[PDB]
Short mmCIF file of C-alpha atoms in Angstrom, two decimals:
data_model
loop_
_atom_site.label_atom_id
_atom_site.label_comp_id
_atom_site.label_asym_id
_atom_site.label_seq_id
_atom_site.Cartn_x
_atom_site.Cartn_y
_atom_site.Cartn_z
CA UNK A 1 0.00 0.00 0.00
CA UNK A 2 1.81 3.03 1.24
CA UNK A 3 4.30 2.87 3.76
CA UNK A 4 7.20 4.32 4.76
CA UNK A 5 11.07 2.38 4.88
CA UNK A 6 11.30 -0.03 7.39
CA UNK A 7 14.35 -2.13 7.74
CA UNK A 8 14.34 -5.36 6.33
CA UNK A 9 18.52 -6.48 7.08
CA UNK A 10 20.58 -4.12 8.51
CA UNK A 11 24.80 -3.76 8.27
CA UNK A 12 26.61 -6.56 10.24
CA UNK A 13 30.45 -6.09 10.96
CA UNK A 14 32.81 -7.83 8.46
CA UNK A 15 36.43 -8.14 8.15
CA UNK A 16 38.40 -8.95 5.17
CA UNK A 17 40.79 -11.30 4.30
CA UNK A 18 38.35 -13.26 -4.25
CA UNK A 19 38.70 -9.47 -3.55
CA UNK A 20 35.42 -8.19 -2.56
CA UNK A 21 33.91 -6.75 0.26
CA UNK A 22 30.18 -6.28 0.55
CA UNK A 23 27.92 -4.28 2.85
CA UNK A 24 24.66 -5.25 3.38
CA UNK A 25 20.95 -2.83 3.92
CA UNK A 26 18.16 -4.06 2.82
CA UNK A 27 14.34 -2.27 3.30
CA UNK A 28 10.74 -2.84 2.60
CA UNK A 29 8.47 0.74 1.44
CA UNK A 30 5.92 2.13 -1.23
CA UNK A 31 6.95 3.49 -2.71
CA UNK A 32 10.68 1.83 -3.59
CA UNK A 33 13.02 3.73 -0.82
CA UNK A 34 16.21 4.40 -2.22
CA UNK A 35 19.80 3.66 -0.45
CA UNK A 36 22.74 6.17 1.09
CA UNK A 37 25.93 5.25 2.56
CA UNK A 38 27.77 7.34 5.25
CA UNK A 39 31.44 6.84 6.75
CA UNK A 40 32.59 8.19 9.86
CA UNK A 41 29.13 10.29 9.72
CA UNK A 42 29.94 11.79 6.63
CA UNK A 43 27.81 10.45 3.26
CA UNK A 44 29.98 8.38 0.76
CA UNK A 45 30.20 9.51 -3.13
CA UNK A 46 29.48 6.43 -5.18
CA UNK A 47 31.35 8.53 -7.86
CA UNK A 48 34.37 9.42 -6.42
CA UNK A 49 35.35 5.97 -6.25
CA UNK A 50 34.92 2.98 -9.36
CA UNK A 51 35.80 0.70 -6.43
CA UNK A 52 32.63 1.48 -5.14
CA UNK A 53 29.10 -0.26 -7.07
CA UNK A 54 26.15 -0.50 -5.38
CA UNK A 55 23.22 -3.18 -5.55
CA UNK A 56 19.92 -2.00 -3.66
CA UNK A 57 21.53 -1.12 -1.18
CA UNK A 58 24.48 -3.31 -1.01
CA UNK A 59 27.36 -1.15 -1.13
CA UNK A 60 30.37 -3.13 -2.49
CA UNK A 61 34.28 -2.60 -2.54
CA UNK A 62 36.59 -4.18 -5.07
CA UNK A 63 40.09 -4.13 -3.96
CA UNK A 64 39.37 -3.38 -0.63
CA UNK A 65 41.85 -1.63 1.14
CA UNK A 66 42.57 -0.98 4.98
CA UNK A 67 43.83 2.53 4.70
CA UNK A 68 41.15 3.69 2.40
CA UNK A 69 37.90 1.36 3.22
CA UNK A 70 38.36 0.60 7.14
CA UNK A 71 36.12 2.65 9.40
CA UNK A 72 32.43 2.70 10.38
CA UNK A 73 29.35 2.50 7.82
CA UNK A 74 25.92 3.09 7.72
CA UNK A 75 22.66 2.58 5.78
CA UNK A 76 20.39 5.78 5.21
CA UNK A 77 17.11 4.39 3.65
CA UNK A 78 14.35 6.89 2.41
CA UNK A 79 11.35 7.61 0.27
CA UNK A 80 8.49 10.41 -0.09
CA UNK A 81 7.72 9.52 3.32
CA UNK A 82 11.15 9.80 5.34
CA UNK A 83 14.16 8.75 6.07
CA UNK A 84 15.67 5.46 8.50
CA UNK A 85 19.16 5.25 9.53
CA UNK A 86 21.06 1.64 9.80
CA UNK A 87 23.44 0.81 12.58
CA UNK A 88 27.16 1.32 11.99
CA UNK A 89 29.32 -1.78 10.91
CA UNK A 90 32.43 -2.07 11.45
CA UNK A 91 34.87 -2.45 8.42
CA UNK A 92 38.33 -3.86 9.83
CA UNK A 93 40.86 -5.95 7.66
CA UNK A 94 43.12 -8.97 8.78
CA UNK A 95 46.49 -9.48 7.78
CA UNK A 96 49.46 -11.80 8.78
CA UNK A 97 53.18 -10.98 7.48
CA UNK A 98 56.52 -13.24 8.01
CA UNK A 99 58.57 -13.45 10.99
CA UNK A 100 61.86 -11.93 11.18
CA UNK A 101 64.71 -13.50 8.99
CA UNK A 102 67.39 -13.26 11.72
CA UNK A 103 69.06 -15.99 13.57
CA UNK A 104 67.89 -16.55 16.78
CA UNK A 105 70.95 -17.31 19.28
CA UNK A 106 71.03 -20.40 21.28
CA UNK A 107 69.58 -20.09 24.79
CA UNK A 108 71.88 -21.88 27.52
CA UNK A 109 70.12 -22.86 30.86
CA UNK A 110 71.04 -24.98 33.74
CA UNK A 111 69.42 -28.55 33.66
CA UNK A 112 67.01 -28.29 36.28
CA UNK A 113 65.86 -24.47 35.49
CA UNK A 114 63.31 -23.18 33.84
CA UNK A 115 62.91 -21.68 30.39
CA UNK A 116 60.68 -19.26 28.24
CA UNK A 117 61.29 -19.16 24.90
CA UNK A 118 59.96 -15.90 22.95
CA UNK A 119 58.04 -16.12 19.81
CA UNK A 120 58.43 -12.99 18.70
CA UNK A 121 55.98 -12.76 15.97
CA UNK A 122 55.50 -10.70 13.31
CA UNK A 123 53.22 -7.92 12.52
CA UNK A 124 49.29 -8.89 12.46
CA UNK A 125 45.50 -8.87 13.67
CA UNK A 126 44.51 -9.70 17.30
CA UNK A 127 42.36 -13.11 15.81
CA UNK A 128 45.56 -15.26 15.49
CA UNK A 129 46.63 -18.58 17.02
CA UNK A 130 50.31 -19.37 18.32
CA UNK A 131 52.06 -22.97 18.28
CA UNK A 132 55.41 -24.32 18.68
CA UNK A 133 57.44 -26.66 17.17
CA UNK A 134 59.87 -28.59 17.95
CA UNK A 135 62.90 -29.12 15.64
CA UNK A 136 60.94 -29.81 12.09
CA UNK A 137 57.55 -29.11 11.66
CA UNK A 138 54.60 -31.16 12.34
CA UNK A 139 56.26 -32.44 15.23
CA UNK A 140 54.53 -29.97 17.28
CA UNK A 141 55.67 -29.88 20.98
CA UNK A 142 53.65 -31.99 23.83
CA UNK A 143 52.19 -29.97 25.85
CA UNK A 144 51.57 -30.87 29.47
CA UNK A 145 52.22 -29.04 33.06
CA UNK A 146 55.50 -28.77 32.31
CA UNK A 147 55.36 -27.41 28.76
CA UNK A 148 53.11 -24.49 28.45
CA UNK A 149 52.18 -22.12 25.35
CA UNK A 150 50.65 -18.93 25.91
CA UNK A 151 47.75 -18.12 23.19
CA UNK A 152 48.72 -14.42 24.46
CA UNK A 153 51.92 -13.82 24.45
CA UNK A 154 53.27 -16.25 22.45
CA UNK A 155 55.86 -18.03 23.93
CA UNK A 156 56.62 -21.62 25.13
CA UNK A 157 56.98 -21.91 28.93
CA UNK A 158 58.88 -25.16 30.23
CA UNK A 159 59.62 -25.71 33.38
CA UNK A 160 62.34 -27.92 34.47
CA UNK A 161 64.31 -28.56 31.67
CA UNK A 162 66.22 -31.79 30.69
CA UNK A 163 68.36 -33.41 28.14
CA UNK A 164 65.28 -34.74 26.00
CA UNK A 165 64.46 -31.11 25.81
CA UNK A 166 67.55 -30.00 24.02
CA UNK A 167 67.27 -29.28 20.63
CA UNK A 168 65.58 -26.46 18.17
CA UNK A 169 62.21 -24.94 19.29
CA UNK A 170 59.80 -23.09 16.22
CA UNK A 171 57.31 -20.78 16.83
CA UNK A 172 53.89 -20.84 14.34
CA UNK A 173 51.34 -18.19 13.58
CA UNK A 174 48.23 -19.23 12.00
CA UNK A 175 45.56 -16.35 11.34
CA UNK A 176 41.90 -18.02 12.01
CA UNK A 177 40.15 -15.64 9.56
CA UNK A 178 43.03 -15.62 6.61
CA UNK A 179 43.82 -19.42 7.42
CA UNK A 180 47.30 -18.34 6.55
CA UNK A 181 50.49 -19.50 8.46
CA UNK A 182 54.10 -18.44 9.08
CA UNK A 183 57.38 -20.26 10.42
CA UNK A 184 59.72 -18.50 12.78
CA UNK A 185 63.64 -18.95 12.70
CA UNK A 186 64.75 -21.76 14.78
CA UNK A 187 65.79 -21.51 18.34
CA UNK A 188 68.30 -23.41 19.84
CA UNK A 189 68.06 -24.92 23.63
CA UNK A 190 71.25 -26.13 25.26
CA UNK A 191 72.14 -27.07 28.53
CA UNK A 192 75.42 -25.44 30.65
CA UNK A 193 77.80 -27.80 32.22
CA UNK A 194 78.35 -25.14 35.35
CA UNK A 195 76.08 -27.41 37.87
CA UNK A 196 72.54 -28.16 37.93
CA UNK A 197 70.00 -26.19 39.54
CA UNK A 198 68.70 -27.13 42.93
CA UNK A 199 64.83 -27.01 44.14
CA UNK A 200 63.17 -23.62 43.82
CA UNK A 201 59.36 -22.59 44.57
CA UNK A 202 57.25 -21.81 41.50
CA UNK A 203 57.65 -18.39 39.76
CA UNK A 204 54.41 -17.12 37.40
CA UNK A 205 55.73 -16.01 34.31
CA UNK A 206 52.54 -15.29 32.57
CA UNK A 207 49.25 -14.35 33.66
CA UNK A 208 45.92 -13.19 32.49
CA UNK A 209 45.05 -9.33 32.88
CA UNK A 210 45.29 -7.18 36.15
CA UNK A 211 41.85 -5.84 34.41
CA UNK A 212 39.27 -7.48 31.74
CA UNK A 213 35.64 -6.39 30.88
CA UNK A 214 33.77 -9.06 28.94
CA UNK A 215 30.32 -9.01 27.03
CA UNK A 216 27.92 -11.08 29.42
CA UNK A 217 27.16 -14.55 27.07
CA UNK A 218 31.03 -14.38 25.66
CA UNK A 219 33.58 -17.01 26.85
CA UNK A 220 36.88 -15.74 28.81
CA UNK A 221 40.20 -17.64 28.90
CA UNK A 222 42.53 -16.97 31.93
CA UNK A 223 45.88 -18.22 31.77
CA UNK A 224 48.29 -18.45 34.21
CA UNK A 225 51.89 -20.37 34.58
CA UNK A 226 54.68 -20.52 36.66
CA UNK A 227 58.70 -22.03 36.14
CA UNK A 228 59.55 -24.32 39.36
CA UNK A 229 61.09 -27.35 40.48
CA UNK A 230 59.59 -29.39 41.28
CA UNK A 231 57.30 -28.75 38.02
CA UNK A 232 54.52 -26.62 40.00
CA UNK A 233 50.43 -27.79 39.99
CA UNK A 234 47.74 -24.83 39.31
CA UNK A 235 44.90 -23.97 41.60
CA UNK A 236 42.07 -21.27 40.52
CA UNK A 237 39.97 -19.50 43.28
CA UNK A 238 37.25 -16.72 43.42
CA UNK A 239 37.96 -14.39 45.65
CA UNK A 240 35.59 -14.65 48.51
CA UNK A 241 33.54 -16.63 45.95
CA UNK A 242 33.15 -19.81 43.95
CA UNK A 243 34.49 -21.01 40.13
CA UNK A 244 31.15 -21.19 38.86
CA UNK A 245 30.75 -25.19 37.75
CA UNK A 246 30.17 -24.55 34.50
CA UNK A 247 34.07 -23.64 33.90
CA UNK A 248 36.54 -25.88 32.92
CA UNK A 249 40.11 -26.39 33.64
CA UNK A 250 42.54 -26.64 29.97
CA UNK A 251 46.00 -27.12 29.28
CA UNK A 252 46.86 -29.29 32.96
CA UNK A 253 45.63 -26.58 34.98
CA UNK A 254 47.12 -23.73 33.61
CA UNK A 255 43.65 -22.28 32.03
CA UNK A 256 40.27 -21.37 33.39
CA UNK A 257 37.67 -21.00 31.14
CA UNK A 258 34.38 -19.98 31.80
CA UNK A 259 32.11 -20.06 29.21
CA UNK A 260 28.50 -17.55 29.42
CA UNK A 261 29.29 -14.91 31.53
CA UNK A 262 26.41 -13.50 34.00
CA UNK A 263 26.83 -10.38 35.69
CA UNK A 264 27.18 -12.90 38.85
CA UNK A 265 30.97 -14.47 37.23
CA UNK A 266 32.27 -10.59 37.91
CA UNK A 267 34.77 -10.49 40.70
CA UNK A 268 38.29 -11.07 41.54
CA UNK A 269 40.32 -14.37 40.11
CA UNK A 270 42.95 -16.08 41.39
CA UNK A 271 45.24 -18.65 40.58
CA UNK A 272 47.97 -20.11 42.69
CA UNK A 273 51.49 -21.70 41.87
CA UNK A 274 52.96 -24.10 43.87
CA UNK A 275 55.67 -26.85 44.48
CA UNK A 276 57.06 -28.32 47.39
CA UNK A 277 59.11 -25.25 48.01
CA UNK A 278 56.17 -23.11 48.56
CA UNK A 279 53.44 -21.08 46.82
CA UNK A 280 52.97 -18.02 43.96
CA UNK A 281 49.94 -16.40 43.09
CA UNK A 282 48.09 -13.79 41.18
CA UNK A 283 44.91 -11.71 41.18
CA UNK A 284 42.95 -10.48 38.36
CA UNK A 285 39.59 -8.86 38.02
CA UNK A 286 36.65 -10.20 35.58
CA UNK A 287 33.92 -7.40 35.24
CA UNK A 288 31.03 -7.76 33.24
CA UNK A 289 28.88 -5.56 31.28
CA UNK A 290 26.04 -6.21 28.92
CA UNK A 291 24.86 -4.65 25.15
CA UNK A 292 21.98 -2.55 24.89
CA UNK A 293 18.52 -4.47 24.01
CA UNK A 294 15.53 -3.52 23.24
CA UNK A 295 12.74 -3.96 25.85
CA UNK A 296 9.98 -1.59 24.65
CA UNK A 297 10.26 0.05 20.59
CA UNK A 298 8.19 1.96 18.89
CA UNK A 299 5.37 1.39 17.04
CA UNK A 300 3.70 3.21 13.89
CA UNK A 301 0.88 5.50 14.84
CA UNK A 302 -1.65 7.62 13.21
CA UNK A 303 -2.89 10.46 14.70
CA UNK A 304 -5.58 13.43 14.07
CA UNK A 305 -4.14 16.42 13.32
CA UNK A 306 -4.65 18.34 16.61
CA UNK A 307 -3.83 15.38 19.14
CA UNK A 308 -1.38 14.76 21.76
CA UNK A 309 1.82 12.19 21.10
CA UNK A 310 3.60 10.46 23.70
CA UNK A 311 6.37 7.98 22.16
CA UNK A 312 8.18 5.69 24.51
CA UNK A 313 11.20 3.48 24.09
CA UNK A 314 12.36 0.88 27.18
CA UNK A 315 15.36 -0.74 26.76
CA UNK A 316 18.71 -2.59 29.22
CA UNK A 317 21.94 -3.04 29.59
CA UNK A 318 24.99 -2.21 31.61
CA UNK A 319 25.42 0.67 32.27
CA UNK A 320 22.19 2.29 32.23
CA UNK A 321 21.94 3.07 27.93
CA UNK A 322 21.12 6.77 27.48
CA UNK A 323 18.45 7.92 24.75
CA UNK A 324 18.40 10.52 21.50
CA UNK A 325 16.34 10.58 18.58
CA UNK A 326 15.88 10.81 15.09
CA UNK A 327 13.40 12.54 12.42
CA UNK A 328 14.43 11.21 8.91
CA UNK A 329 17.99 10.21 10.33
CA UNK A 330 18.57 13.69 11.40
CA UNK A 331 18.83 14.63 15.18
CA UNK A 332 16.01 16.58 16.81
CA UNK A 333 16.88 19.03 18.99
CA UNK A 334 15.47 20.89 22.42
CA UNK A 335 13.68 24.34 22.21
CA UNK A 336 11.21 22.78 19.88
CA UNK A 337 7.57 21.91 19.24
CA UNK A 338 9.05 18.05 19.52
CA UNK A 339 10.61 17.56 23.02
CA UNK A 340 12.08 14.26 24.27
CA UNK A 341 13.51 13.60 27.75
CA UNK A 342 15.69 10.33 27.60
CA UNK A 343 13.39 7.96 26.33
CA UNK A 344 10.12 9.81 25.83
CA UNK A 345 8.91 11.41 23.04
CA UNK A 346 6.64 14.22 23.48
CA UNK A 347 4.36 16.76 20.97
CA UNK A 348 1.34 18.67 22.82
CA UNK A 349 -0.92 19.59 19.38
CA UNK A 350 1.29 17.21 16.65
CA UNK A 351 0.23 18.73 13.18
CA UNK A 352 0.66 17.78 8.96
CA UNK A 353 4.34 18.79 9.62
CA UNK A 354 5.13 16.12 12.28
CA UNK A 355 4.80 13.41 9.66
CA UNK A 356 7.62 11.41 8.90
CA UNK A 357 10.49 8.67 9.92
CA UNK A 358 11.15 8.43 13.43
CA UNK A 359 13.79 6.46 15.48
CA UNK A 360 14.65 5.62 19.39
CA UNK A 361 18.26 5.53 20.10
CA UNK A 362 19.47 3.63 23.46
CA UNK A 363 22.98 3.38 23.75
CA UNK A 364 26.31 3.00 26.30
CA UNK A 365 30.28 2.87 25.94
CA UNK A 366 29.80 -0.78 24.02
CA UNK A 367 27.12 -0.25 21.48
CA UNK A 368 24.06 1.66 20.08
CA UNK A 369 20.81 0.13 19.25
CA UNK A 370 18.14 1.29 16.92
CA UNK A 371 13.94 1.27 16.95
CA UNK A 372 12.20 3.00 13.77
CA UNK A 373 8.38 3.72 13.01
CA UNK A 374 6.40 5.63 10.74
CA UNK A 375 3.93 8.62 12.30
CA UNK A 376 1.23 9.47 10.03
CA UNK A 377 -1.11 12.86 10.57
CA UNK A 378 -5.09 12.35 10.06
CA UNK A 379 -5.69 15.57 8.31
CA UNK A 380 -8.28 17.99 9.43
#
């Protein structure tokens, strides 16, 4: 009939690794609403680049590049009727380059003592995935509570090293999202002949954050793992709490995973270190906070032409979300007939004027979400 746009798919983020990249908006309206594509809140010029086609309202890149392409786009949908605004996707690119040619000099340690052995790896994305080698690849190193391999630093932990552990250790890269994969130099592991070492109490040598703040359904991986002799067992703890049961213990001990963060997991996490010798430990904290949702959006509504309108959007999250809206994507502002207070929308005598797009904004420090409806004005 006649309608005005209403969103049908909106942007989702996407990150590139076939050289294409495509953004997706899709809307329902009578008639046909027609497509517009900001960056960084400024509208994009299909012209000014050939890279850039466009397919109702699929805005496409060939030969995408991060310089040039990466940032934050929207979809601005209108017809006769108004205007709608999209939510911004993010644009971000992955990319994995080769470790440093250089020789990496032997590293001598007393049989007995403890060793970490640095990666080192080379420029790339944060959604990578570390692994060692030992000597020639695929014989990957065994990994137990005595060899340990950080997924965040890099490096391969052992504890008390022996003769079977002499030899060349290799440190791999492997990008999830590329698939791609890079070798590091090999580096060797020798033994002095000045003594052994003796027994020593367990020393952490890597740790998860002093500080993390996690999206509440995500999954969080806590590492911690300490060089001692005798080769040292790990114990988590929850400060003045409990290790929810749903976690699970990986890698002998040395991870605690909890899987589907509540609001409840927040609070302080420790894990302890410890040998016959005595004990190590280490605090972190785990807070939690939780996207924006809708609870209550917006309808459409007609109204006659000298009525009262009282708009109301509800919505959660942590913190608290704050509101602002839109008229045909375009902010409306105090000191007018329209006045909203956070998430209330208020016109005394609404008139032919007041007809148009509207949309609810709620929104914190981790995201904005979006509520549209169309208001149409009975005419008198």
């Amino acid at each position: 009939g006649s309608y005005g746009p209403v969103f049908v798919q909106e942007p989702d983020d996407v990150i590139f690794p076939e050289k294409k990249v495509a953004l997706n908006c899709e809307v329902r309206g009578n008639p046909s609403p027609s497509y517009r594509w900001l960056r960084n809140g400024t509208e994009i010029a299909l012209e000014s680049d050939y890279r850039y086609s466009l397919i109702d309202g699929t805005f496409i890149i060939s030969n995408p590049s991060e310089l040039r392409d990466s940032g934050l786009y929207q979809c601005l949908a209108t017809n006769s009727f108004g205007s709608i605004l999209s939510r911004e996707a993010t644009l971000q690119f992955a990319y994995l380059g080769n470790f440093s040619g250089r020789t990496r000099s032997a590293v001598s340690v007393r049989e007995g003592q403890g060793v970490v052995l640095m990666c080192s790896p080379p420029p790339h994305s944060p959604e990578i995935i570390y692994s060692w080698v030992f000597n020639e690849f695929p014989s990957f190193v065994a990994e137990d509570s005595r060899r340990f391999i950080s997924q965040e630093t890099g490096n391969l932990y052992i504890s008390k090293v022996q003769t079977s552990d002499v030899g060349s250790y290799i440190c791999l890269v492997k990008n999830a999202v590329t698939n791609a994969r890079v070798l590091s130099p090999p580096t060797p592991l020798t033994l002095r002949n000045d003594g052994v070492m003796g027994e020593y109490e367990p020393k952490i040598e890597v740790h998860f954050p002093f500080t993390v703040t996690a999206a509440k359904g995500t999954t969080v991986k806590m590492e911690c793992f300490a060089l001692g002799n005798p080769v040292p067992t790990i114990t988590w703890m929850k400060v003045n709490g409990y290790i929810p049961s749903k976690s699970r213990l990986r890698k002998s001990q040395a991870v605690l995973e909890i899987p589907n963060l509540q609001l409840d997991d927040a609070g302080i996490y420790e894990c302890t270190a410890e040998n016959s010798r005595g004990k190590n430990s280490f605090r972190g904290q785990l807070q939690i906070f939780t996207y924006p949702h809708w609870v209550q959006k917006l309808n459409d509504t007609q109204l006659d032409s000298g009525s009262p309108l009282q708009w109301e959007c509800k919505a959660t999250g942590k913190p608290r979300p704050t509101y602002r809206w839109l008229k045909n994507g375009a902010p409306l502002l105090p000191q007018s007939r329209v006045d909203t207070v956070n998430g209330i929308l208020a016109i005394q005598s609404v008139n032919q004027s007041d007809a148009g797009m509207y949309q609810c904004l709620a929104e914190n420090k981790y995201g904005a979400i979006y509520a549209s409806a169309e208001l149409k004005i009975l005419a008198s």
